[PDB]
Design a protein around this ligand. Structure first.
Ligand SMILES: [Ca+2]
Ligand SMILES: [Cl-]
Length: 496
């Protein structure tokens, strides 16, 4: 469950947050495949509650109603079409599996679901599964509210309701079975793995019992006996009874400490500096690299939710964001996930963004299609960070240097750092308040290399900066602290 199942030479997955199945299919063929992306993390494909107040929030997708593949992203036919098309071009699909719970216990009974399924939270009635009151942890929880009240108690964290969401009795084989049913349907369609939502709220043992029941990957695209890639969402910033290491037997685990710290360093908070990154990874208290799923931001925390609070870098902080993503893609630690967002009318009613609930770009609830601009960016309020030249090019940088050691580290003891990846890549950063101008030892063979930050390599020439590496492998770098993109990156495949 630790291997991504991506093609050889494709080292990252992109989260296409709330995208429609039809758009993802197109994206796989017109961009992801040819630009070297390894896979896509999709939003929950199962039927959820349609919340009308506030109006169709993004988080309604984390409140399941059934396991029918019918959401704002599309129906089963479209989902199947998407997986097939992406797989045919070597781009994998990873499903966001919401299995800890069903909907809010105070939601109202009826058919206000994305597929019209009837459900009654008050009675714990989910006929479309089906689930009854005998399938929820109500009796198992021991809190006065039946909700999670204290994170120092491992048992309530897992047996009580997360903010009122009906907590499934994962201890029962029936429930584990229904879930496996759902997950197997997806595997047979062609999904390469899963993001297990709210793993912190489940017992490692229950998760295990579910994985036990899963099929191997679809033998049309995956060699016989392949296991689904598993990455568990466990928010662990330390000092809690529940530890991310508790989940290592099930697969990888989200390393939230990564983005929190990268965010603090780049924002130069708490007297942190880039030169401190010289021992980035385990050296900073992180989980083993072979179990980490890393990212700068996610859907929760780009909204000041998740974990990291105010330090998290996002598309809103574009210049610094590109730097952080760049550093992540160049550094050997973990399996990387790139975020792809949508713009929302962020509005601070002093302190808090009161619109952090707003769902994807829509017309009366119907998700808007992803349009492409002439400059290869996206319209209809889709941010498409994965299409930003600097990010897209760093995804390819990672592919090219995969497996190379961390070498030729340099720092000015402040915020000017550089490092190479064997003899296949070199990156330079200037996050100080003055120009960086120094001749560095790169570890790269002589020649003219296109900087992939300021431009591209287009057969025979560079459209941005050119770096000349001398036969002694030295190159001169000059980066103004005022540059749009205060970093340079060259690699074996950007060489003329
Ligand atoms: Ca639970
Ligand atoms: Cl996540």
């Amino acid at each position: 469950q630790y291997s991504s199942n991506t093609q050889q030479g494709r080292t990252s997955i992109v989260h296409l947050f709330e995208w429609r199945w039809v758009d993802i299919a197109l994206e796989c063929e017109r961009y992801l495949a040819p630009k070297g992306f390894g896979g896509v993390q999709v939003s929950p494909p199962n039927e959820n509650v349609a919340i009308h107040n506030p109006f169709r929030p993004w988080w309604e997708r984390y409140q399941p109603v059934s396991y029918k593949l019918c959401t704002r992203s599309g129906n089963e036919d479209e989902f199947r079409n998407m997986v097939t098309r992406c797989n045919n071009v070597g781009v994998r699909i990873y499903v966001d599996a919401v299995i800890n719970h069903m909907c809010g216990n105070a939601v109202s009974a009826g058919t206000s679901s994305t597929c019209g399924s009837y459900f009654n939270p008050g009675s714990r009635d989910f006929p479309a599964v089906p689930y009854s009151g005998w399938d929820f942890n109500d009796g198992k929880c021991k809190t006065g509210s039946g909700d999670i009240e204290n994170y120092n108690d491992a048992t309530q964290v897992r047996d009580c309701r997360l903010s009122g969401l009906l907590d499934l009795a994962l201890g029962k084989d029936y429930v584990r079975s229904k879930i496996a049913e759902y997950m197997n349907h997806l595997i047979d369609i062609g999904v390469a793995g899963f993001r297990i939502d709210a793993s912190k709220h489940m017992w490692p043992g229950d998760i295990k019992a579910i994985l036990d029941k899963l099929h191997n990957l679809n033998s049309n695209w995956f060699p016989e006996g392949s296991k689904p890639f598993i990455y568990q969402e466990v928010i662990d910033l330390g000092g809690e009874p529940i530890k991310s290491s508790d989940y290592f037997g099930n697969g990888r685990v989200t390393e939230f400490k990564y983005g929190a710290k990268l965010g603090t360093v780049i924002r130069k908070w708490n007297g942190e500096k880039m030169s401190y990154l010289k021992n980035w990874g385990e050296g900073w208290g992180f989980m083993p690299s072979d179990r980490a799923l890393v990212f700068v931001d996610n859907h929760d925390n780009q909204r000041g939710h998740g974990a990291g609070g105010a330090s998290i870098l996002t598309f809103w902080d574009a210049r610094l964001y590109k730097m952080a993503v760049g550093f992540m893609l160049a550094h050997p630690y973990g399996f990387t996930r790139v975020m792809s967002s949508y713009r929302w009318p962020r509005y601070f009613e002093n302190g808090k963004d009161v619109n952090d609930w707003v769902g994807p770009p829509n017309d009366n609830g119907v998700t808007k299609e992803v349009t492409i601009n002439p400059d290869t960016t996206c319209g209809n309020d889709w941010v498409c960070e994965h299409r930003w030249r600097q990010i897209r090019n760093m995804v390819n940088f990672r592919n090219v240097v995969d497996g190379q050691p961390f070498t030729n580290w340099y720092d000015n003891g402040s915020n000017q750092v550089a490092f190479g990846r064997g003899n296949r890549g070199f990156i330079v950063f200037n996050n100080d308040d003055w120009t960086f101008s120094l001749t560095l030892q790169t570890g790269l063979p002589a020649g003219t290399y296109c900087d992939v930050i300021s431009g591209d390599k287009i057969n025979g020439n560079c459209t941005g900066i050119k770096i000349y590496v001398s036969d002694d492998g030295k190159a001169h770098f000059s980066i103004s602290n005022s540059a749009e993109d205060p970093f340079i990156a060259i690699h074996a495949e950007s060489k003329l």
